[PDB]
Structure 1
């Protein structure tokens, strides 16, 4: 139960904190920009895009 032992500030977790704990996020975003894919695969299905139309 080490997962619950470290407590959970997901309402206030910083994206800089994720970049610090995961450079994989920074590398994936950087290569995803370099190739040009502004789409995020599998985002739209569980999270509503909230485009006007």
Structure 2
């Protein structure tokens, strides 16, 4: 946990983070994106519950 705490402090791209880096750190990214396309739901739930969203309607 000490080492992990040090890892969060000394390494963290977060001003220029790439989704490619997250796809690399977890294949969960691509798995979920593919599962959503396969599911046929293009609204990922929870996204707008802790990020915004806007609409005209």
Between structures 1 and 2, the one with greater helix share? 2
TM-score by length of 1: 0.78
Choose 15-24 or 2-11, whichever is displaced more: 2-11
Flag the 1:19–1:4 CA change in 2: closer, same or farther, 3 A: closer
Gaps of 5+ in 2: none
Gaps of 5+ in 1: none
Structure 1 segments of 4+ aligned residues over 6 angstroms from their partners: none
TM-score by length of 2: 0.74
